Structure formats: C-alpha cells, structure tokens
Amino acid sequence: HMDYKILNFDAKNDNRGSLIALENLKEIPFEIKRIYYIYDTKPDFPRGAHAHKELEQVLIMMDGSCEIVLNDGRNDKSIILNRPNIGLFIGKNMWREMRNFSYGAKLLVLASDFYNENEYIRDYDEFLRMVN
Amino acid sequence: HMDYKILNFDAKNDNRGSLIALENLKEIPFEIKRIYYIYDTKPDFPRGAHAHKELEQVLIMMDGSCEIVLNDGRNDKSIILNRPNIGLFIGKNMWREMRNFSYGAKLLVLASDFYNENEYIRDYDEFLRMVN
Amino acid sequence: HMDYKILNFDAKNDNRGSLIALENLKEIPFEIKRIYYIYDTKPDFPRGAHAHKELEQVLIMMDGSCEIVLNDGRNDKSIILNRPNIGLFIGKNMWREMRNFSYGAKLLVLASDFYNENEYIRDYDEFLRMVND
Amino acid sequence: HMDYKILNFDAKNDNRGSLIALENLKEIPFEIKRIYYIYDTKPDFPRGAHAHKELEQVLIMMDGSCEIVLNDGRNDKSIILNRPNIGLFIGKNMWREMRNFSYGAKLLVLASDFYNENEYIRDYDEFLRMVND
Numbered sequence: 001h002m003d004y005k006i007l008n009f010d011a012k013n014d015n016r017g018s019l020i021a022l023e024n025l026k027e028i029p030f031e032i033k034r035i036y037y038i039y040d041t042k043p044d045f046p047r048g049a050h051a052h053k054e055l056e057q058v059l060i061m062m063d064g065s066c067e068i069v070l071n072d073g074r075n076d077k078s079i080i081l082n083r084p085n086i087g088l089f090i091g092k093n094m095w096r097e098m099r100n101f102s103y104g105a106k107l108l109v110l111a112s113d114f115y116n117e118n119e120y121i122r123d124y125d126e127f128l129r130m131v132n
Numbered sequence: 133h134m135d136y137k138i139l140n141f142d143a144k145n146d147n148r149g150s151l152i153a154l155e156n157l158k159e160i161p162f163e164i165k166r167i168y169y170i171y172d173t174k175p176d177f178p179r180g181a182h183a184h185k186e187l188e189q190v191l192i193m194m195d196g197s198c199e200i201v202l203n204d205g206r207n208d209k210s211i212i213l214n215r216p217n218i219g220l221f222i223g224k225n226m227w228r229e230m231r232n233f234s235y236g237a238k239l240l241v242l243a244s245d246f247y248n249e250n251e252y253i254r255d256y257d258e259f260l261r262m263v264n
Numbered sequence: 265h266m267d268y269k270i271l272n273f274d275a276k277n278d279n280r281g282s283l284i285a286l287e288n289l290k291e292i293p294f295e296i297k298r299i300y301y302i303y304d305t306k307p308d309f310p311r312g313a314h315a316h317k318e319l320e321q322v323l324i325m326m327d328g329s330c331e332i333v334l335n336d337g338r339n340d341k342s343i344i345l346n347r348p349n350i351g352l353f354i355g356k357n358m359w360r361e362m363r364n365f366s367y368g369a370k371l372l373v374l375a376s377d378f379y380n381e382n383e384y385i386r387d388y389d390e391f392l393r394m395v396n397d
Numbered sequence: 398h399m400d401y402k403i404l405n406f407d408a409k410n411d412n413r414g415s416l417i418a419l420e421n422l423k424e425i426p427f428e429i430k431r432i433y434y435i436y437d438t439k440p441d442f443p444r445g446a447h448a449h450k451e452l453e454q455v456l457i458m459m460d461g462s463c464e465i466v467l468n469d470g471r472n473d474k475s476i477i478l479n480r481p482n483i484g485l486f487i488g489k490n491m492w493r494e495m496r497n498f499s500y501g502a503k504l505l506v507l508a509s510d511f512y513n514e515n516e517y518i519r520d521y522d523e524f525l526r527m528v529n530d
C-alpha cells in the first residue's frame with residue numbers, strides 16, 4: 001500500500017482514432033499547474049533519481065515504453081508504462097527513477113504545482129533521513 | 133492578424149534527451165483545466181470541424197504531423213504542426229479542422245476549461261451567423 | 265511520364281495489428297540486395313539530393329511523414345508519404361530529395377544493388393549534364 | 398548455445414539524423430528474398446508462436462520496444478529490442494514469440510526466403526516432436 005495508483009483512462013474510439021480527456025480533480029486527483037514532457041530518450045541513459053515532499057504527478061507514456069521504479073523508503077515497486085490509455089499517479093514523499101526508455105520514447109507528466117528546484121531531493125540518503 | 137499564435141518552446145537538452153515544461157499563465161496564456169490527446173489517427177480520416185465561443189487551446193504535435201486549418205469568418209490559415217517543441221495557440225471564436233494526420237500521429241491539446249458539448253459549434257453556417 | 269510508381273500494399277490485419285510482406289520480383293519489382301533506414305529526422309534538416317544511373321529503390325515511411333521531391337531534369341513532383349501501407353518506387357536517372365520530415369520520422373529503403381558511393385550524383389548541375397548527353 | 402545472435406549496427410550520424418545500411422552476406426548473413434513489417438501492435442496482444450526448419454530471419458525494432466522470447470526445445474531466452482541500432486538474428490529450428498509490444502511499436506524482419514505457410518510450425522507440441530526425432 002504505497003502512494004501510487006494505476007489510472008485506466010476511458011477513450012472515445014471512432015474511425016478517426018482515439019481521444020482521452022483528463023480534467024482537474026476528476027481523472028486527475030489534483031489541479032494541473034504545469035505539464036512537461038520528455039522525448040529523445042535512450043535505453044542506456046535513465047532519468048529521474050529524485051523525490052518531492054508536496055508535488056504530486058500523473059505520468060502518461062505518449063510513445064514507447066519505460067520502467068518507472070518507485071521507492072517510499074522501504075519496499076520498492078517497478079511499474080512498466082507502455083500505452084497512452086494508462087497513467088501512473090505518483091503521490092508525496094516518493095522516490096522515482098525512469099529507466100529502459102525505448103529509443104525516442106515520449107513521456108508526459110501532469111504536475112500539481114509550478115517548477116520548484118529547491119523542493120527536489122536529488123540525494124537518496126537525504127530522502128531516507130526525511131522519510132524517518 | 134487572426135487570434136492564433138505559434139509558440140516556440142525552450143527545451144532542457146542533455147544526454148538523457150529533451151524536456152519541455154509548460155506552466156499556467158506563463159508558456160500557456162491561460163490556466164489548464166483539462167488536457168486531452170488524440171492518437172491512432174489516419175491521413176484520410178480528418179478531425180475537428182468546430183468552433184468555440186470562450187474556450188482557448190494550445191495544440192502540441194507529440195508524434196507525427198498534421199495540418200491545422202483555422203478560420204475566423206473571413207480569410208483562413210493552414211498551419212502544419214510536426215515537432216514537439218512548437219505549440220499552436222488557438223483563441224476564441226475560431227473554426228479549426230485537423231487533416232493529413234500522419235498514420236498514428238499523436239496530438240496533445242491543453243484546454244482553458246472543462247469539456248462542454250453545448251458550447252461546441254459543429255455547423256459552419258451557424259459559426260458564420262455567430263461571427264456576424 | 266516520370267519513372268516513379270505509387271505502390272499500394274495489402275496488409276494482413278487482426279486484433280494484434282497489421283503485417284505487410286514484400287518479396288523479390290513480386291511486390292518489389294527487383295531483387296533486394298540492401299535495405300537502409302533513416303531515423304532521428306528533423307523538419308528543418310532535409311535529406312537526399314542525389315541521383316543514380318542504375319540503382320532502383322522502393323521508399324516506405326514506417327513512422328511519421330515526409331515529402332519526397334522527384335526531378336528527372338524537368339519540374340519537381342512532390343509525393344507525400346504519411347502511412348506505412350504505401351510505398352514509392354523510384355527508377356533510374358531520378359534526382360530525389362526528402363524534406364518536411366515529421367520529428368523522429370523513420371524511412372525504410374529497399375535497394376536493387378550494393379552501396380556504391382562512386383555511382384552517386386550529389387550535384388544537381390552534374391545530374392542535368394548527365395541527363396542532357 | 399541457442400542459434401540467435403545480437404547484431405550491433407554502425408549508424409552514419411549527422412545533424413539530419415541516423416542511417417543504418419544492411420547488405421546481403423555482409424551485416425545480414427543470408428540473401429534477403431523478403432522483408433515484412435508489423436505495426437498497430439498492443440502490449441496485451443502478443444505475436445509469433447511459430448518455428449521454421451529452414452527460414453533464417455533478422456529482427457529490428459524500428460519504433461518502440463518488444464520482448465522476443467526464443468525457445469529451441471529447452472528454456473525460454475528473453476531478448477529485449479528497444480532501439481533501432483540493434484538487430485536479432487534467429488537461426489533454424491527456433492520457436493519464437495514477441496510480446497510486451499509498446500503501443501504502436503513497429504518490427505522489421507529481413508527473411509532468407511519467400512513466404513511458405515506450409516513450412517510454418519504454429520503448434521509448440523509439434524515443434525518439440527520435430528526437435529526430438
């Protein structure tokens with residue numbers, strides 16, 4: 001019982017393709033203040049390796065695949081994201097890395113707040129002191 | 133001088149790839165209430181063919197290409213979206229269609245409000261009466 | 265009539281996706297000796313700008329779109345490739361460019377012979393001289 | 398030692414992107430008679446589940462990732478393909494599956510011979526009987 005959740009999204013499917021709509025405090029359990037997206041990824045060059053005190057996130061794999069590795073201080077879960085109709089809710093005080101990006105994989109992140117470099121914990125031991 | 137704008141985004145480029153961050157009332161000229169994204173597109177099956185009174189939008193081509201065709205009531209502009217570091221701001225009282233989607237092209241839309249089927253103008257003549 | 269053909273491919277479609285199969289002297293009207301693919305393309309960085317007296321090619325956009333521009337010494341013909349089930353045969357004495365690549369668009373090329381840098385014409389003026397002998 | 402090889406390809410990289418070239422009896426250790434590509438793949442809809450006495454293949458993920466599962470009648474070997482500059486040679490008397498496709502992932506296959514549905518083994522039990530003669 002870690003603070004993440006798999007979100008299965010409802011798509012409007014038709015001849016012209018698929019559409020997924022995600023709204024503030026409905027499919028998204030917070031108000032979107034920011035989105036960012038990561039592209040030109042490579043499988044040998046992983047990303048993240050950080051935690052956040054207050055910031056909450058929803059991760060959608062727009063293109064390709066990756067392994068999200070989550071850690072709350074004790075046991076740690078590997079979640080593979082590889083389709084656009086699934087999102088990963090990442091709660092508070094959660095260490096995450098993203099590895100094994102398929103070449104050119106495109107990740108989309110929906111953020112509960114504006115970018116704040118100070119509130120990044122980029123040191124795993126510092127994270128563990130903060131958890132305990 | 134129609135109510136659209138090309139947005140050239142700043143990317144943090146490094147070994148692990150590219151990251152673009154877009155924030156409420158900074159890179160985005162409104163507060164995000166909703167995002168939706170369109171995938172499994174086809175070049176022979178176009179989309180949109182509608183206008184909106186109040187709703188404002190930012191369009192980002194996450195994958196592949198398409199032609200956005202804009203119309204405000206008089207002259208009409210074709211804008212080709214084909215890279216993730218460019219967004220298209222679509223203002224108020226603007227008719228748009230999206231055609232010539234590359235097979236499997238992925239469009240991302242950032243919306244200034246919650247989904248409201250009533251405020252869709254899906255009739256071009258109705259749109260023109262409303263403009264004049 | 266310029267020496268190119270649009271090839272419409274038959275796909276085997278099920279709930280697991282689509283398969284296209286291309287064989288020597290059947291859907292491909294030559295013997296594949298080499299294939300090449302291009303990726304990490306950019307809308308603002310076009311490619312091609314060469315011609316070949318002998319080499320026949322078949323072009324397939326596996327991902328995204330680009331604009332193939334074909335010239336046999338008269339006017340440019342643009343052919344948009346934006347789906348994987350269409351191919352473009354390009355015959356002999358054909359100058360070609362490929363521009364307006366969607367970002368990260370991928371092109372597959374089935375070629376009729378082994379790579380010879382010597383047999384490349386990479387100058388348009390050289391190509392017109394060659395076509396006006 | 399199972400009859401597969403990981404192929405590392407040399408790419409020509411410039412500011413216009415990357416090109417990989419694959420030739421008969423050079424980077425590909427057979428003569429290409431046919432190529433096929435698969436697209437509109439789904440993580441939950443795996444493909445393959447067949448073997449071939451004669452047909453040699455080279456697999457390349459041009460877009461996205463999948464898990465190739467290889468079996469010559471002993472234990473499964475998983476090989477992840479997730480970049481376009483790696484290929485997977487699959488020799489004779491090899492059962493293969495391809496699963497955990499990223500959504501819309503695209504696979505290119507260079508094949509040593511023309512398509513023969515007759516020469517396909519699409520039953521695993523049939524494959525073990527064949528490998529235990």
Ligand SMILES: Cc1cn([C@H]2C[C@H](O)[C@@H](COP(=O)(O)OP(=O)(O)O)O2)c(=O)[nH]c1=O
Binds near residue numbers: 034036038047049
């Ligand atoms: C998330 C984010 C990052 N950045 C900057 C911080 C770094 O200099 C750079 C890369 O971010 P970084 O934290 O290293 O990325 P990841 O989570 O993929 O490991 O981008 C912003 O400017 N704004 C943002 O909203």
Ligand SMILES: Cc1cn([C@H]2C[C@H](O)[C@@H](COP(=O)(O)OP(=O)(O)O)O2)c(=O)[nH]c1=O
Binds near residue numbers: 166180
């Ligand atoms: C934009 C949007 C559409 N939809 C529905 C409306 C339609 O039934 C379906 C397709 O939308 P539609 O307006 O036809 O799409 P497009 O702008 O690409 O032409 O999705 C939602 O449920 N929520 C949304 O936020």
Ligand SMILES: Cc1cn([C@H]2C[C@H](O)[C@@H](COP(=O)(O)OP(=O)(O)O)O2)c(=O)[nH]c1=O
Binds near residue numbers: 409
């Ligand atoms: C087509 C091809 C190119 N190359 C090399 C030649 C160049 O140095 C490099 C780029 O090829 P180039 O002709 O510049 O590519 P394009 O037709 O896409 O513009 O790749 C090979 O080594 N083998 C081949 O079969």
Ligand SMILES: Cc1cn([C@H]2C[C@H](O)[C@@H](COP(=O)(O)OP(=O)(O)O)O2)c(=O)[nH]c1=O
Binds near residue numbers: 276283431444446512
């Ligand atoms: C490989 C191949 C398949 N096909 C047909 C056979 C089947 O009806 C269909 C799907 O092939 P199948 O063997 O089911 O594909 P996979 O190996 O990806 O599981 O395509 C051809 O017609 N030619 C070919 O060269």
Ligand SMILES: C[N+](C)(C)C
Binds near residue numbers: 001002004
């Ligand atoms: C607790 N969780 C299983 C929903 C992540």
Ligand SMILES: C[N+](C)(C)C
Binds near residue numbers: 133134136138
């Ligand atoms: C008016 N506009 C040129 C900025 C669209």
